[PDB]
Design a protein around this ligand. Structure first.
Ligand SMILES: [K+]
Ligand SMILES: [K+]
Lengths: 385, 382
């Protein structure tokens, strides 16, 4: 469970039995034909896979390139999170667990988890941070409609990190009945491998679709990176393929302003939620609060596989600011009629940061941005626009 | 363009010119395979077609049936309306039009139209009636469409369509009018149905690979009738029990509903001879429904013909019953259905389906209806 020096199982000792039980159960389904049949049948009929590779003609003409969008926004619940939530709650039910817990910031992973819990008829308790938006109010009503319990997180600054903290305390105090569902590729082994292996269907589908459109592998593949599950899903089948893989972290107000979530670019090696990885820290090793106009990227850590990919040069990493992501949000809505998630808008914004004239670019559209409409229109950068 | 005695072009004389040029342009693409190739490529890559046919295991176990759901909620914009909007604006591009106009009530059809207009890079002007509406207005503005609030009449979907047709009449040189359903003057009912029949043609090729036989029932909600006619047309005279469900509102015998085929009378609405809710003096009556998508006093002429010749059966369910189906599918399957499609799901309690294979048309997702369902007095009590 080590990606070079990163990863590991840096957890309280009482969690070692659950991690070893999870690792053994996951190793059993690796060859189980029945599991992958029930899972892939749900990905097709319940989630909507395979998602199409859409040629954005008007976006391509603006940049003088051939830009393709991997349409993960067309999935059920409207984000890639549904791919990981279905497979993990299914694994939980197969392991005999009767309760599901998870943490969420705005409510996206909470909705995807509560959706899979209602599909499999399991108890679901979601710990959610505080934000005064119609988006979160809708997610609360979604999760309550799906039958899940929502516990407003009051610890810390009531962020996604604080919600994950409360969900982990729930897991430890309910280890007999509860399965913990992480939202990204951040966590103790084998969680980063489990989440990535559930998301790599994105990159596998992409590898089969792009030669039908261009007769060759793409020149670039761009995806937004916070924890890194959607980027790892599309990057993994293309590792060491020669395709330029670019992960875009949240630059916030600026990489030198102290208000961002670029764990790889500005973080230090540390421990967060079970994994040794790059975390935003001060000089004394204390985790720092992240910031981003995108709630999905507002996380101070990054998956250990991305820290390994960055070190070995297999994936290139950069960041874009809040304003650049807001501009890409409006740009795709006007040019293609697709309202992208503010998370994926960071990857779309990077189309301006690379010389793509005449290049074939695939952008991972990780979700739709209807949840972000009020945040975008009320932002002072857009209001002044 | 007559479905027996229904249909026609009952319009003012000024509209006859654009309707003849629109019919003429539509006959040209009837055999043009380059048109339908571009249309189907967009349906696949842009809208997300083909949509899956999902076996609802927990829902099937509740009634003893094998209930399947045609997942139109997984389309772009989250409703079947996108199938029609993409095809009409594609037709607008071939005709040389550069402006798109349409009418909408809560804004569901306005978003689908503004989405297709942005995809083709065209000007879009939407006429709309009075959080779901606020969000839809923000969508249409983010998509680049001009939203004109409707002030005439009761400011409903019917009044918005009137202003949109008024807009089309004034600018019939550069503007293509996009209807939302299979209601309107010829050739619009056939154009919309021919764009929506991809649903039934997909369902016809999917249910064999899942049951070996043809389905026993195919249920779908009906207002104007675009999503129902889309899934019904490839199954007409096939033996399958085709059932359309209209909006019963507060009750069929309450005067607060939208069941045009059940409680309406023959008449004219927006250019089509069909069944319209009206009083004993021929004046059109206002419709009511907990779902804004079904809040329309008319029905498509092809549905009036199907009901008369017995090729499709029609019924209606109450607001309270649609709210139960809304909560039921969310709790049982984790799929929040549209309050429109919830009328079809509620019909699973009104027929014997024990051992029968049923296909319900999930016309759209119901995240737009979350605030309306929870703040309703019937749901607030429970
Ligand atoms: K981060
Ligand atoms: K009606």
């Amino acid at each position: 469970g080590n990606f070079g020096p990163y990863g590991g199982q840096n957890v309280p000792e009482i969690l070692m039995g659950a991690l070893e039980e999870l690792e053994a159960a996951y190793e059993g389904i690796m060859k189980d034909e029945s599991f992958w049949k029930e899972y892939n049948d749900l990905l097709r009929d319940y989630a909507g896979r395979p998602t199409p590779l859409y040629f954005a003609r008007r976006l391509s003409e603006k940049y003088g390139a051939r830009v393709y969008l991997k349409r993960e926004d067309l999935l059920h619940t409207g984000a890639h999170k549904i791919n990981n939530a279905i497979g993990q709650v299914l694994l939980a039910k197969l392991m005999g667990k009767t309760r599901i817990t998870a943490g969420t910031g705005a409510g996206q992973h909470g909705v995807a988890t509560a959706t899979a819990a209602a599909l499999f008829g399991m108890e679901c308790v979601i710990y959610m941070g505080e934000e005064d938006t119609i988006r979160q109010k809708l997610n609360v009503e979604r999760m309550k409609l799906l039958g899940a319990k929502v516990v407003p997180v009051k610890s810390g600054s009531r962020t996604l990190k604080d919600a994950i903290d409360e969900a982990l305390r729930d897991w430890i105090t309910n280890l007999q009945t509860t399965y913990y569902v992480p939202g990204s590729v951040v966590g103790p082994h084998p969680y980063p491998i489990i989440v990535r292996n559930f998301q790599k269907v994105i990159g596998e589908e992409t590898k089969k679709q792009i030669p039908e459109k261009e007769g060759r592998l793409p020149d670039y593949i761009v995806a937004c990176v916070s924890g890194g599950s959607n980027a790892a899903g599309i990057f993994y089948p293309f590792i060491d393929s020669g395709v330029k893989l670019i992960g875009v972290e949240a630059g916030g107000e600026g990489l030198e302003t102290g208000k961002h979530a670029a764990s790889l670019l500005k973080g230090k090696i540390g421990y967060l939620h079970g994994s040794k990885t790059f975390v935003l820290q001060d000089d004394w090793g204390q985790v720092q609060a992240s910031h981003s106009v995108s709630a999905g990227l507002d996380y101070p850590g990054v998956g250990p596989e991305h820290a390994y990919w960055r070190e070995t040069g297999k994936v290139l990493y950069d960041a874009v600011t809040d304003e650049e992501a807001l501009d890409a949000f409006i740009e795709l809505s006007r040019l293609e009629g697709i309202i992208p998630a503010l998370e994926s808008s960071h990857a779309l914004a990077y189309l301006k940061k690379i010389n793509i004239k005449g290049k074939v670019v695939v952008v991972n559209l990780s979700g739709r941005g209807d949840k972000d409409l009020e945040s975008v229109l009320n932002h002072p950068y857009v209001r002044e626009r």
